[PDB]
C-alpha cells in the first residue's frame, strides 16, 4: 500500500500476514527464505505508483534518480517455440537415431 491511513491497525494481528509500504520495500519481506515468488496483494494508488517509482524501459524512473530498469538477456525465450520454428528446422542436419550397440 501507500499513504498510510490505518491499514496497519486493521491488518496487524491477523497471523502470518505481512504489511509493507511501497516507497520502503524489503527483499526480506518480498522473498522470505531466499526463494522467489511470495504472493502479494496490492492497492490502486500503490499499483499506479509502481510505474512512477521504477519506470518503463523507455523512460527513466522519476522518483529514483539515476536508476533505469535492468537490461533483458533473451528477448523471447520459449525454447520449444524457437526450436520448432521453421527458421531453425530449415537448417538442421537430420535426426540420427540408430543406436548401433556393441557387436560380439
Amino acid at each position: 500500500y501507500n499513504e498510510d491511513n490505518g491499514i496497519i491497525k486493521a491488518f496487524r494481528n491477523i497471523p502470518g500476514i505481512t504489511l509493507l509500504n511501497v516507497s520502503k520495500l524489503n527483499i526480506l519481506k518480498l522473498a522470505p527464505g531466499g526463494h522467489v515468488g511470495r504472493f502479494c496483494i496490492w492497492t490502486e494508488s500503490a499499483f499506479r505508483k509502481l510505474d512512477e517509482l521504477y519506470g518503463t524501459w523507455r523512460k527513466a524512473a522519476s522518483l529514483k534518480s539515476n536508476y533505469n530498469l535492468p537490461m533483458h538477456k533473451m528477448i523471447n525465450t520459449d525454447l520449444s517455440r524457437i526450436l520448432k520454428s521453421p527458421e531453425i528446422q530449415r537448417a538442421l542436419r537430420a535426426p540420427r537415431k540408430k543406436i548401433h550397440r556393441r557387436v560380439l
Partner: protein, 122 residues
C-alpha cells in the same frame, strides 16, 4: 516463460520430495510422479490431469483453459466421467488425440485413469 519457470522450479521449489532416493514432484495437477519437464502441470500453458471424484464414483479430468493465464480461478476447467471404464478410457483417448491439446502424455492420462479405476472398484 515455461523454461524460465522450469529453471526456477526444477529445484528449490515447494512440493518436491527427495527422500532416501529419487525425486517425486508431487504437483497438485500432475500425471506421473516424476519431477520432469514433459510431465509438468503448473508451468505449461496446456496441461492434462485426472483426479478422483469426491463423491467416490467416477474420475474427474482437469484440463487447463489456455484462454487466459494469470487467472487460476478459471484456468482449470473440470469434468466428471462415470462409465464402464472402457468408454471412459476411449473418451480420454479421444479428448487427447482428436484435439491438438497435448498430443504427448496420452498414456500418462490413460495409465493414471486405469490405476484409479482399479483402485476404485472393490
Amino acid at each position: 516463460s515455461a523454461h524460465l519457470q522450469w529453471m526456477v522450479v526444477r529445484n528449490c521449489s515447494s512440493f518436491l520430495i527427495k527422500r532416501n532416493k529419487q525425486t517425486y514432484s508431487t504437483e497438485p495437477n500432475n500425471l506421473k510422479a516424476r519431477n520432469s519437464f514433459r510431465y509438468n502441470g503448473l508451468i505449461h500453458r496446456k496441461t492434462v490431469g485426472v483426479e478422483p471424484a469426491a463423491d467416490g464414483k467416477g474420475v474427474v479430468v482437469v484440463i487447463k483453459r489456455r484462454s487466459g493465464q494469470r487467472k487460476p480461478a478459471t484456468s482449470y476447467v473440470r469434468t466428471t466421467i462415470n462409465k464402464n471404464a472402457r468408454a471412459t478410457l476411449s473418451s480420454i483417448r479421444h479428448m487427447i488425440r482428436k484435439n491438438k491439446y497435448r498430443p504427448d502424455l496420452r498414456m500418462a492420462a490413460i495409465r493414471r485413469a486405469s490405476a484409479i479405476l482399479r483402485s476404485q472398484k472393490p
